Amino acid sequence: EYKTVVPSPYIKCCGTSECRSMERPDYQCQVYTGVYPFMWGGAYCFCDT
């Protein structure tokens, strides 16, 4: 019975990050462009793009 483990998402509001391409059995990763988080107390990353 399979079990798709998913970690916490990583986010950084100054620049960019990149992929890793490891060898986990069905590894699937992708980095997305300019987002805008909205955590509990207002906005999170303190910029807009």
């Binding site: 019975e1 399979y2 798709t4 998913v6 998402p9 986010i11 059995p25 069905d26 699937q28 990763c29 992708q30 997305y32 987002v35 805008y36 988080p37 909205f38 955590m39 999170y44």
Partner: protein
């Protein structure tokens, strides 16, 4: 195949090198929430708890009962067994008495 039996295949109980091909695919989060959305087909082994049929003992041919743990087919009724024996001369009774 992603959805029919055996989409997660390992060579033995303690090993490595799984064969996950469940068609995993990621999308992008909607507007203003921190979440990771994805989409995949459900488990084949959870389809194979209810899509499996009856056991064989409901329709086995010669009225034989099929047990399971050291897999058996016990108490059939087919064919015939030949024998051959050799009893000693002390087991008989002589024609005198």
């Amino acid at each position: 195949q992603p959805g029919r039996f055996g989409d997660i295949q390992s060579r033995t109980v303690e090993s490595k090198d799984l064969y996950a091909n469940t068609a995993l695919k990621l999308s992008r989060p909607s507007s203003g929430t921190v979440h990771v959305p994805y989409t995949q087909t459900p488990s084949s082994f959870k389809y194979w708890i209810k899509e499996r049929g009856t056991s064989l003992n409901d329709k086995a041919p010669f009225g034989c009962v099929i047990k399971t743990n050291p897999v058996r087919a016990e108490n059939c009724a087919v064919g015939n067994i030949p024998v051959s024996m050799d009893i000693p001369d002390t087991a008989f009774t002589r024609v005198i008495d």
